[PDB]
Structure 1
Amino acid sequence: ERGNLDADSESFNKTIQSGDRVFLGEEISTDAGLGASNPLLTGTAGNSEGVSLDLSSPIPQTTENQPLGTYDVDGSGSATTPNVTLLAPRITDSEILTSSGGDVTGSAISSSDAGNLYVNADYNYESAEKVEVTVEDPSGTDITNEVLSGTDTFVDDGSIGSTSSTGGGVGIDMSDQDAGEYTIILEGAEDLDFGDATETMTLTISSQDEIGIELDSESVTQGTDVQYTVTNGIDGNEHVVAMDLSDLQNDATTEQAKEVFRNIGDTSEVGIANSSATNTSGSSTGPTVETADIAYAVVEIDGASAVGGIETQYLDDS
């Protein structure tokens, strides 16, 4: 069938019936259907008017010399006749989601947690051909057969956000492979693999996997703002950066201590916390500077890393 490709377990179908849609890079079948009953057609209206489409030869790409439109054998017409509408190929969206959920595309993921990944996408060309997935190692070799987990290479239309194998999408168990940069390639099953019909999504595998913290500088004076970055963390989850109140200057006040952490970067909330109660940056309602014991700044992460900042002013020289 065409339009319902999986009803017959066929990877591709190239028999076109009157009224359907045809894409730019297709290779119509001349054996049966509208490939031998009407080989050549002409434009009907608009820019397409007057131009000639030959079904037997591969339809040209580039959308130049073959303007998009509707084609009718007779010429400009409105009566029922063998006609077809040319449309461009496209894949609107693609993503790699962890089993829990959340995108990790273009970002390094721990080897331990990279064991139940999923790939989902939305594409325009579902009536003609499904879209293939090909995982490539940093060396440049097809590793699809090694990481596949019980599902055929074909991914269905829609099914974006599907965290389960029941919905369309392919499951990859990337735990066994070593550290490196891997590229997932999506392209049409047979012919629709040219520009705008293919996408290369990167993914980084690494095993240094403790939640990491780095500073642009280590030796600084008071008052110099320092930006700190958290690395190798789960996306969509909130970490906590702490500050020992012993390091604060003795002569600080309550309002003077709530400005140690800035709201810079991905930080959501800042404040000081006692063992049982907290005093956030919104209001001076919780514990006081002497009453509280820790200073915190809850920080999210977007991607593989998040950035915050500190103010070395009012800090002891140690």
Structure 2
Amino acid sequence: ERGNLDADSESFNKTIQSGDRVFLGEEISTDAGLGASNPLLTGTAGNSEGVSLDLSSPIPQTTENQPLGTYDVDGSGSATTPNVTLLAPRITDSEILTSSGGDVTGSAISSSDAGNLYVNADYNYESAEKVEVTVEDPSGTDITNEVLSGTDTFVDDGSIGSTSSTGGGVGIDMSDQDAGEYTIILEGAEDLDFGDATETMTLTISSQDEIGIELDSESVTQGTDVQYTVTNGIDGNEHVVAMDLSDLQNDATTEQAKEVFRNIGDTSEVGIANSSATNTSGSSTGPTVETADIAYAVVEIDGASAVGGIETQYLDDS
């Protein structure tokens, strides 16, 4: 039907009934429905009053010659009878997420882990037409049939954050393809593919660079804070940066060792851990400075890299 498009396994339908909604770029069908029973429509109020809407012809766009609004059969009057409201086609949000969450759009991902990706989007035109997905190689060729995994190229409205094929969204297995930057193209099934109804989501495939760490300075004195950055990691997962207690000053205390790593940047928790238990900065309950053996700071990543910091104060001169 119309308004429930996937209920009949149809990618589109153009049989408009009275009171439904119509979008800018549609091409109404003149068969049974409100396309032969009432082909001439006139505006009701606002900027659309008096203006006519010819359903037997394709509807113009960019809000010119067809103002948005409710349309009567009589125009601005005392009749509320076969009826059309004219909206605009829109794609609001769209993301590429891994099998366990984590947006990876516009960011390089490892070829090994790029095997259970998902594509999701939110679009305004759900009653009229579904939105297609078309993966394009950097050379510019349709590779969709090679990488498609399920959902039949049609992604439903909503379903953002759906990590399973049960919900709306299409899975692509981009593991077999070589390294490069790829573009995912979303557009309407038949007609709604112009501006603001289509979006190109890019994706970079490259060899898995192992975790990379860099420092803004290598030769520093005590007391000078140093910022460390973690590079080339999977988004949404928690790394652990460790600190050997042998490098710590011998005259340090329990509370003196839990502040080597700062809460600066994306750091989540700081403290000192042992093979059995851990002593975080929240309380001095776990191992003591002599009891513990490692100082750590669990850090997440947002994008391609995350930044933390250290306090070179109370560190051995070595």
SS at 2:184 equivalent: strand
Change beyond 3 A, Cα 1:11–1:273: closer
> Deviation at 1:248?
1.8
Q: Identify which range, 102-111 or 30-39, moves more after superposition.
A: 30-39
CA contact (8 A) 1:110 1:232 kept: no
> Deviation at 1:70?
0.7
CA contact (8 A) 1:22 1:87 kept: yes
> Deviation at 1:148?
0.8
1:238-290 per-position Cα deviation (integer Å, ceiling 9, x unaligned): 22110011112334343332221110111111112233333221233333323
CA contact (8 A) 2:151 2:168 kept: no
Change beyond 3 A, Cα 1:78–1:106: farther
SS at 1:12 equivalent: coil
CA distance in 2, matches of 1:278, 1:11: 55
SS at 2:182 equivalent: strand
CA distance in 1, matches of 2:147, 2:199: 19
CA distance in 2, matches of 1:179, 1:149: 20
Q: Identify which range, 145-154 or 169-178, moves more after superposition.
A: 145-154
Q: What residue is the counterpart of 2:162 in the other structure?
A: 162
CA distance in 2, matches of 1:144, 1:48: 41
Q: Identify which range, 300-309 or 6-15, moves more after superposition.
A: 6-15
> Deviation at 1:150?
4.1
CA distance in 1, matches of 2:268, 2:163: 27
1:207-247 per-position Cα deviation (integer Å, ceiling 9, x unaligned): 22423322233333333322212223233322211001111
Superposition TM-score, scaled by structure 1 size:
0.90
CA distance in 2, matches of 1:78, 1:225: 75
Q: What residue is the counterpart of 1:202 in the other structure?
A: 202
Change beyond 3 A, Cα 1:67–1:202: same
Q: Identify which range, 261-270 or 288-297, moves more after superposition.
A: 288-297
Change beyond 3 A, Cα 1:224–1:143: farther
Q: How do residues 159-198 of structure 1 correspond to structure 2 at under 5 angstroms?
A: 159-198=159-198
1:143-172 per-position Cα deviation (integer Å, ceiling 9, x unaligned): 212201244212223333333323322111
1:43-67 per-position Cα deviation (integer Å, ceiling 9, x unaligned): 1123322222222333222224432
> Deviation at 1:76?
1.4
> Deviation at 1:123?
1.9
CA distance in 1, matches of 2:132, 2:286: 57
> Deviation at 1:80?
4.2
CA distance in 2, matches of 1:140, 1:78: 55
CA distance in 2, matches of 1:50, 1:41: 10
Change beyond 3 A, Cα 1:146–1:219: farther
SS at 1:57 equivalent: coil
Change beyond 3 A, Cα 1:286–1:33: closer
> Deviation at 1:125?
0.8
> Deviation at 1:30?
3.4
Identity %: 100
Change beyond 3 A, Cα 1:219–1:204: farther
Q: Identify which range, 128-137 or 59-68, moves more after superposition.
A: 59-68
Stretches of structure 2 that go unaligned for 5 or more consecutive residues are none
> Deviation at 1:196?
1.9
Change beyond 3 A, Cα 1:41–1:100: same
SS at 2:227 equivalent: strand
Q: Identify which range, 187-196 or 47-56, moves more after superposition.
A: 47-56
> Deviation at 1:24?
1.0
CA distance in 2, matches of 1:20, 1:78: 20
> Deviation at 1:78?
4.2
1:118-154 per-position Cα deviation (integer Å, ceiling 9, x unaligned): 2222322111111011112223332212201244212
CA contact (8 A) 2:211 2:231 kept: yes
CA contact (8 A) 1:225 1:312 kept: yes
CA distance in 2, matches of 1:160, 1:111: 23
Q: What residue is the counterpart of 2:264 in the other structure?
A: 264
Change beyond 3 A, Cα 1:84–1:138: same
SS at 1:152 equivalent: helix
Change beyond 3 A, Cα 1:288–1:6: closer
SS at 2:47 equivalent: helix
Q: What residue is the counterpart of 1:289 in the other structure?
A: 289
CA contact (8 A) 2:111 2:208 kept: no
Change beyond 3 A, Cα 1:31–1:273: closer
CA contact (8 A) 2:150 2:165 kept: no
Change beyond 3 A, Cα 1:277–1:13: closer
Q: Identify which range, 32-41 or 187-196, moves more after superposition.
A: 32-41
Superposition TM-score, scaled by structure 2 size:
0.90
Change beyond 3 A, Cα 1:275–1:196: same
CA contact (8 A) 2:109 2:208 kept: no
Q: Identify which range, 139-148 or 56-65, moves more after superposition.
A: 56-65
